[PDB]
C-alpha cells in the first residue's frame, strides 16, 4: 500500500497565543511528532512512536529543532528584507518521501512564503525551481553549495525511506489495518421531476476510497458530485458521490470492489 513520511515547518514573523515556530511530522494522515517554540521540546504525537523510540531520540531532536528554529527565524528575516515586507508573514517547509505499492519511491522538498510556493527541489537534476526573482536569488545561493544538494538527494532517496519503513513497523497495527466501508444508496425526489441518488460510505480505513456511478454498466456522461473524504473522529473515514436523473454505485477500497445496483 502507498505510504509516506513528511516533516512540516511553520515560521511566523511578529505573531499574535500563536507560536513563532512549529514543526510536525506525519506518517500518512497520522501526526507522529511535534515541536514548537513555546514548549521547546520535540514530543511524540502517536503512542506507537512513544513506545518505540527511547528518550535519547527525543533529547537529540529537541536540540536539533532548537537550532533549526533559530535558522528559520533568520531565513524569514532575510526573505522579508528581499521583498521589502513589514509586519507578520509566514514561511513554510515540507520535506518527505513516498513508498509506493509497486516498490518505487518519490522524494520531495519545498518551501512557501505567505502560503504560496516559493522554491521546489528537483532531486533528479539537483536544482531548485524559483517562482519569482527573490526565490531566484535564494536558489543561486543554495545551488552554489553542491555538497548540500547531494546531501538532500541522499536523504530523500535513502534516509527518509529507511525512517518510513521503521515507523511503518512501529505503527503496523494502526497503519497497515483495513476497515472496510459500510455503503448505502439513498433515493429521493428533490425538485419536481428531479431524482437525486446518493452513494454514501463510512467506517473505512485507510481514507483512500474510489466511488463512482455507472449507467447500464457504462461510465456516466452527466456530472457526478463528489463529497470529501472526511475523518469521522474514531480513526475511520466517510465519503459520498451523487447524481441526478438502470444506475449502480461502484466502490473500490483496499483491493475489494463493491456494486450497489438501484
Amino acid at each position, epitope marked *: 500500500r502507498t505510504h509516506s513520511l513528511r516533516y512540516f515547518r511553520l515560521g511566523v514573523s511578529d505573531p499574535i497565543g500563536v507560536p513563532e515556530f512549529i514543526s510536525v511530522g506525519y506518517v500518512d494522515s497520522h501526526p507522529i511528532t511535534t515541536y514548537d517554540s513555546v514548549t521547546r521540546q520535540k514530543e511524540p504525537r502517536a503512542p506507537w512512536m512513544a513506545e518505540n523510540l527511547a528518550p535519547d531520540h527525543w533529547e*537529540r531532536y529537541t536540540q*536539533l529543532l532548537r537550532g533549526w528554529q533559530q535558522m528559520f527565524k533568520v531565513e524569514l528575516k532575510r526573505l522579508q528584507r528581499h521583498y521589502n515586507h513589514s509586519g507578520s508573514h509566514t514561511y513554510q517547509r515540507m520535506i518527505g518521501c513516498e513508498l509506493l505499492e509497486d516498490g518505487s519511491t518519490t522524494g520531495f522538498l519545498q518551501y512557501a512564503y505567505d502560503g504560496q510556493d516559493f522554491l521546489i527541489f528537483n532531486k533528479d537534476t539537483l536544482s531548485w525551481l524559483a517562482v519569482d526573482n527573490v526565490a531566484h536569488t535564494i536558489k543561486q545561493a543554495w545551488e552554489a553549495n553542491q555538497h548540500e544538494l547531494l546531501y538532500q538527494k541522499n536523504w530523500l532517496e535513502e534516509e527518509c525511506i529507511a*525512517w518510513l519503513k521503521r515507523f511503518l513497523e512501529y505503527g503496523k497495527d494502526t497503519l497497515q489495518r483495513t476497515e472496510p466501508p459500510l455503503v448505502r444508496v439513498n433515493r429521493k425526489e428533490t425538485f419536481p421531476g428531479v431524482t437525486a441518488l446518493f452513494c454514501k460510505a463510512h467506517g473505512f480505513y485507510p481514507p483512500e476510497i474510489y466511488m463512482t456511478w455507472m449507467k447500464n454498466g457504462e461510465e456516466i456522461v452527466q456530472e457526478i458530485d463528489y463529497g470529501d473524504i472526511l475523518p469521522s473522529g474514531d480513526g475511520t473515514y466517510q465519503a459520498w458521490a451523487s447524481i441526478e436523473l438502470l444506475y449502480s454505485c461502484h466502490v473500490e477500497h483496499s483491493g475489494v470492489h463493491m456494486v450497489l445496483q438501484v
Partner: antibody
Amino acid sequence: QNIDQPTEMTATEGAIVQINCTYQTSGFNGLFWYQQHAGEAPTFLSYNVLDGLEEKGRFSSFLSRSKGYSYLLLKELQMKDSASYLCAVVDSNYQLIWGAGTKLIIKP
Amino acid sequence: GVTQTPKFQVLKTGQSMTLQCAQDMNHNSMYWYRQDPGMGLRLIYYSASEGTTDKGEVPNGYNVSRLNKREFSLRLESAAPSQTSVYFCASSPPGGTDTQYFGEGSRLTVLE
C-alpha cells in the same frame, strides 16, 4: 556504531597510498576526511555522501554507500603529507562518529 | 577562526579550570572534544545554538556554558588525573553537509 581504519601506514615519497575506512552505522548522512599534523588541530580534507570518486589535486576520496566503505587516496607523496588522517561519519541523528585515525609515515 | 585558551595548563588534583573558546564566523553549533591516544575524538558537550547545550559521549566531570553566539566555555569542577588530555573546541556553520572548524587545542595535565 563503529568506524574502522588502520592505526598506521607507511609508504615511500613520490609513491601512492590508499587509506581505507569502513563504517557500520544505523543511518548515513555523509563521510568526512580530516588531516591532523602532530601537535596541531584537525582540518577538513573532503566530504562524500553519494557514490563516486572526488578528486582535489593530489588527494582523492572515494565512497561506496552499499559497501559502507570509503578511501582517501594520496598520490605523488611528499614528506609534508606525514600526519594523521581522520575518518568521520554522520549517522541517522546527524551526529559525527569519529574514527581513531591513521598515522601516515612517509619513508624518504 | 576559532580561538581556544589556554594552549597548556598544569593543574593540581581538585583544582578548578575553565577552557575558553570563541569564534567570529557566525556559527550556531559549538563542540567540546577530548582527544586521547588510540581513540577517536570524544564529544563531551555541544551547543546546537545559542540558548541550548547538551551532553556528548563523556560529560562526567565537566559542565559548559554557551555564554553568547561567539563563546562556549568548558569547566572542570574538580580536576582529576583522568582529565589529563588534549581538548578541542570546534564550531560549524548553520546546517549542511557542513564541516567543523577546530581551535588549536588545549593540553591539560592533572597532577597529585
